[PDB]
Symmetry: D2
């Protein structure tokens, strides 16, 4: 088994099959032709290796998919136009009216909205469970429980889930476990190795790494991914990834190990700095010894990540003053870019929640979320320092 | 109002607002930053004009959208990752359990599958009607009829509906009319100017014109398009169009009038040829006086289009041999490319239908569909001529 | 049928020549080889590719399959044996002239040249020992009299940028066959759709593919077409070693995309410019108008003989000079004020202070570039809109 | 002054100047329009500071140029279509017949060919000198000497020049010192800070880092760079860089520090390994204590680089066997890619030399050059080990 970095660069491609091209050619084409109509018929009937239409399948996409499958340790991958494309295609495929889906307590805003205002209004029942409490989950299981879906760590408060414990219970009741692995990437956490059936990503974030594409990935078993490809994507979402963006995403993945090492090292220093400060009420960072689920985080994640959540004394008032004073960090939603970013979840990425939904799903009105970038740590420390002083 | 060609090249863009750039800069960026967090919050609340995240809205995509809205004569546009993206995003936002959707008798294969095996399995009721029979449409209207959805001409047999006559019935009962205008483009037919509320396109086809991107477009009122953007696209499909692909689509749109004029002139010559050949049993082309809905075609489309459907005397056997013999035409699904294409709908684009459904909804075995390209007509005729000899 | 030895039509070749989807997994559009390098199955195979015995690929500055397709397609459209794609029109011109000329050689030049070409010749290669001579290439007797034993290359544009002076390409070629000179024609203005100098006896043609070939103003690119021997030499000396003007595969793909509508775009550019030129010739403010489609065009019969249609470019002059030209160009609302040509968007510019600013004031009067000259590149917009814009701007120039 | 990594990500760009775009919009446009013709005439005269034509200058290219200038510590940068673009545009601007150029003893093959068979045949005089030998260099200066040009380390034997020493000598005659810094990049070595006037790069290599573009960079003083832009590029080469490629190059530059750290760390391990092997006669790697110019290397380079050259005892025959047995390394020219590469300079990168010129200018038959990539070192080690086994 070649190492992670080796596979991120090489897996599924030999230059000698494409005229010696070191970088795979980009198949920017909507359709593919057939040598005979019988050959083509066979492609549609599903009984043939090949290609017919890029919404169903495309060789640039297929390479990205195989490579992502290798990094997560799954059988099959699927590339989509966005993270939301990956989540919707998956959930539209696996659920029908009268199925239940058990969710983690805190979700990304558009995932929450899709669940409650989207698929939830088509007869699919939803219940929220703390996915670190295996007893509370087991109690929540019903015979209608088809899917278990959660993020770990969760956007935006960093709440962990016990992936292996959830999976044991799901295996017992015949439930499909789907884990949003956006924050960690396969370099830091591999939920499939801990018993998840499917992983989904916003490849828009760390996997791309450079903020220039929107994309989604699904990885899991051949049987589940085939269904998601041929139903969710083909017929229910049409969330097709551009071959151009797929080739940029592959370009990004080639440095994923190096970039994540630096995001993690920078974020550790900033977290430890923010811990020592009087303006800071509390911090959620997995790599601080004081993190409430430090032990569980270490059994699942090989490093503590690039994301920090924290609150100031002064609440939202001091939050605004801090964020508005940042000169190197930018004020923006998104994460996992080379550029360091800051945002206010309640009024931005989680503004789809009502104030009461925000309150009891653990999205504070004072919370600031930092995506720590690849800039020099001293420049980033200086920027945070002066913004804290301006926030007082 | 400037002419169609002028608007396809210029509408919505002034080089002076982007440093004099004659071609608009490509905004290949997932996120946008804010000068203050209150500016950001204001954007997320709708109260400020600006950008935050490309899945929701992006300036390259917005120029495409505004240009397409102008060409169709509608108020607002939306760009998506595929035609299926446009259709699913639209219908997921407009429909809920208990609603009825009235459908044209014949639909594109994945549209049919989406309706019967996707949204129709989430409690939405479907009924098919002959949209050319206005009395039968009226007779099928119920108070639960929320949406009337059809293609005109229909993929693949070219069956037409009287859009203004359908719209009248919709206005009487309070239904929303959604027209798939893929085949005509806004250059040949503008269903919004005949009372339709929304038009959808596979921009993958004629609008791109060159076979290199997958894309979809929705045009209609600001009110409907805003909902499709903020619910269907944002939450239920994630079918986000790449700025790179949007830029290519705008490039293609600049020659739309010229290309369609050639597609049409070529197809007319080819159709007249085919109509005189001894191997041909039947042909559906709207520009032939023998076309059953010739008067309606001349009234509603400014040219008869680039698409031909016909049947050979020897059924499926002769169809196969014909298609296998083509040397200049390629055997492929898709349409509206520079390259001339041929396919067998029953085994390909409409293979999601069962044999019973195909017979019921008008997709015979025997049917061949041509997308007539931009090649020299003498070359296309010689290719068709020899393939017809080969068909015996 | 009338037999499979018939050449497919121009439009067919612009779409299909050199490419079969079945050789690339069925891809209808050719995959883009956006790769700098190519690998070898063995070291010997690799040594053979640098030698030039093994057919294949090693490094995109020398050669690349996306570029090769573009090159073969342009060769087909021009009726030449081989093609070469470069980073710009100037790339094509410089790579060609650096390959063909050495100190002591003389190049005979058309009386009027694109500004950067003029500058390259007089201030570039001309300063490294190459002798230059300008001649009216419409005057075959003067060309014959200017030929010397040192004359290695004859180089000109037809029609010339920006005054549209023409040369008799077949007449020039005949003189060049008799004396032994290589004839190089810049065919940017016509494209192979309207004029094919290699079929009239030229050895090499060069293009700014940035213009009509692309058609959409989004790339910079150059093309050279000619004999296998001359194009190979240009590839391996000019491009590889003396300019490094390598075309991006991304841009070559976009250029190919544009070439697929070349016939349709040129037809419309030409029909639009014809209506505009006839309109302008009837207007009070116009001193003179040069459009090959008007019988008043000084070399009208030569234009009709070499060009299948009269082009998309108009050069004209208002009564009022510089003065009135400024006020016309400034009142345009649909036309843009800009250099370049052959875009979907209609453009207007002023050679003497823009594309020919590199010429001294004296050199502009000597090589036929007036102070009142206004050049129009007529685009693809609706002709009624372009007429309305030019009509209102004429009024405002009074 | 912000750190290297900060500047490689941010220098010269503020999102707030471009509608908040986190990533700069790509100006894929050939031409730029004017609000008036006076304004237009002023751009061509250099009196107004706008844009007119992308061969001269373009905002995407200018951003790249300013960022590279910041990384090298120079006043001004220029982006070109290739490394050869950069070298030729530079030398054509600076040299005229009767001028002399003093050259490093070993040069990249196409540079050598350009010099001997290109500009050298237009009356420019060439002399090769050992650029570590300051008394020989002093002695070789003549009144005709106008440019001193070399690579350090030299492609392909790793010979170093004393850049500060060369610059001291040049200064006594007003000569212009041009350094090809391709191998090191500005992260490892900054010749302008050691007294060079101009640096050139094949940005195709480490700067891009991903093998997908061809590009060149010149950095230097404003007056020299202005002339290279307006004479060498504009008029003498036309080596214009695509804005698309310039955007990809900027993307690559954002991880330059992280990639170079890994290239160097990997190469250090492989060099240490190869230096102890019985099949190996000689090795050139700056990081080895036995490297002849170890002390000088450490004065100029912050890390010893990702390139290794070595010779096997079995000569050219053993060389061939080694290369053919490699399974993870590819056989290819080029360097500075994520993928590890190996080549034979005598029959590839330096095949433009004759046998006697190779022997004379230090390029052996038997030399193998490795460009060590970003793959897992344990995988690279295994591949080199088995290939060494197969060579003997
Ligand atoms: C502005 C958007 C942010 N997130 C997105 C996201 C998505 C959805 O991913 P697309 O945006 O559709 O690619 C899915 N899963 C997770 C854990 C996510 O964070 C953000 O928080 O900053
Ligand atoms: C291979 C695809 C074909 N059609 C597609 C299509 C779509 C769906 O559009 P995307 O493919 O998702 O962009 C929507 N609406 C119509 C009238 C269509 O023809 C085809 O028939 O050849
Ligand atoms: C702004 C540029 C214009 N022309 C360019 C051009 C070139 C040089 O071509 P690149 O620009 O290097 O692609 C070569 N040959 C001809 C007959 C040309 O017109 C223009 O005049 O409008
Ligand atoms: C195949 C090419 C290789 N080298 C190139 C190169 C160039 C020329 O750079 P473009 O190739 O024109 O970008 C300039 N300067 C140096 C030190 C170089 O190594 C190679 O060695 O493997
Ligand atoms: S968002
Ligand atoms: S399809
Ligand atoms: S120019
Ligand atoms: S090379």
């Amino acid at each position: 088994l070649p190492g992670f970095a080796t596979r991120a660069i090489h897996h599924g491609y030999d230059p000698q099959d494409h005229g010696g091209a070191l970088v795979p050619p980009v198949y920017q084409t909507a359709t593919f032709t057939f040598p005979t109509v019988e050959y083509g018929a066979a492609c549609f009937a599903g009984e043939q290796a090949g290609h017919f239409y890029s919404r169903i399948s495309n060789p640039t996409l297929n390479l990205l998919e195989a490579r992502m499958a290798s990094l997560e340790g799954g059988e099959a991958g699927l590339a989509l136009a966005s993270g939301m494309g990956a989540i919707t295609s998956t959930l539209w495929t696996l659920l029908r009216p009268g199925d239940e889906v058990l969710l983690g307590n805190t979700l990304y805003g558009c995932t929450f909205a899709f669940l409650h205002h989207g698929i939830g209004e088509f007869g699919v029942k939803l219940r929220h469970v703390d996915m670190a409490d295996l007893q509370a989950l087991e109690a929540a299981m019903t015979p209608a429980t088809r899917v278990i879906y959660f993020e770990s760590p969760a956007n935006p408060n960093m709440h962990m889930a016990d992936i292996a414990g959830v999976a044991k219970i799901a295996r017992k009741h015949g439930a499909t476990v789907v884990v949003d692995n956006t924050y960690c990437t396969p370099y830091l956490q591999r939920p499939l190795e801990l018993g998840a059936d499917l992983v989904v990503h916003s490849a828009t974030k760390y996997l791309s790494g450079h903020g220039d594409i929107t994309a989604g990935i699904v990885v899991g078993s051949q049987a589940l991914v085939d269904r998601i490809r041929l139903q969710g994507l083909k017929d229910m979402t049409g969330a097709v990834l551009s071959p151009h963006d797929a080739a940029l995403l592959m370009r990004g993945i080639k440095t994923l190990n190096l970039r994540m090492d630096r995001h993690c090292a920078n974020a550790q220093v900033l977290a430890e700095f923010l811990a020592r400060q009087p303006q800071v009420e509390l911090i959620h960072y997995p790599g601080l010894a004081s993190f409430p689920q430090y032990t569980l985080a270490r059994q699942q994640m090989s490093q503590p990540g690039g994301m920090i959540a924290f609150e100031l004394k002064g609440g939202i008032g001091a939050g605004r003053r801090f964020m508005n004073a940042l000169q190197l960090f930018s004020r923006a939603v998104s994460l996992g870019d080379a550029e360091s970013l800051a945002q206010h979840p309640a009024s931005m990425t989680h503004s789809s929640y009502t104030p009461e939904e925000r309150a009891h799903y653990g999205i504070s009105e004072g919370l600031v979320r930092l995506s720590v970038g690849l800039e020099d740590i001293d420049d980033l420390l200086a920027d945070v320092q002066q913004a804290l002083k301006a926030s007082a």
